[PDB]
Amino acid sequence: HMCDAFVGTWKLVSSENFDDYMKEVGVGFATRKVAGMAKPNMIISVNGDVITIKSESTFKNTEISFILGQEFDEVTADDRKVKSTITLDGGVLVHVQKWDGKSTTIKRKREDDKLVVECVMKGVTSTRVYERA
Numbered sequence: 570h571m572c573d574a575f576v577g578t579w580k581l582v583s584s585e586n587f588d589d590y591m592k593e594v595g596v597g598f599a600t601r602k603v604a605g606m607a608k609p610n611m612i613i614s615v616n617g618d619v620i621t622i623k624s625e626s627t628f629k630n631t632e633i634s635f636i637l638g639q640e641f642d643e644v645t646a647d648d649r650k651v652k653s654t655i656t657l658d659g660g661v662l663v664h665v666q667k668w669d670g671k672s673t674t675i676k677r678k679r680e681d682d683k684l685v686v687e688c689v690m691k692g693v694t695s696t697r698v699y700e701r702a
């Protein structure tokens with residue numbers, strides 16, 4: 570029951586400061602433009618200890634399956650090859666991605682009927698809000 574309140578199908582409804590976050594990450598111009606348009610469907614499910622997060626979008630489709638605390642390989646929508654570790658901290662999913670000596674942290678939390686995603690790269694944060702699809 571660890572992630573019950575995350576499970577479901579979610580649709581992106583707002584994004585703030587995502588271009589600046591992507592710039593901080595190192596995403597190039599064309600990818601930032603096309604990625605910034607997308608309104609993905611995020612589909613979260615749990616089967617035993619395995620959590621799956623899928624993103625269905627007009628830009629890219631992605632999928633990760635993982636066990637909390639256990640590092641895995643991830644290919645991000647912008648085509649970074651990262652090493653990821655996801656934990657639960659006080660009911661927040663905390664996802665750290667490491668690549669090329671860099672690090673970014675993505676937090677996903679339930680707030681009211683929304684799922685709020687905060688993406689942080691150094692001093693730059695983007696907030697992406699999802700509602701149930």
Ligand SMILES: Oc1cnnc(SCc2ccc(Cl)c(Cl)c2)n1
Pocket residue numbers: 581591594596604611645646647675686688697
């Ligand atoms: O909206 C969401 C929901 N869950 N995780 C994320 S991860 C942030 C992300 C997404 C797409 C691109 Cl292209 C880049 Cl650079 C980074 N974002």
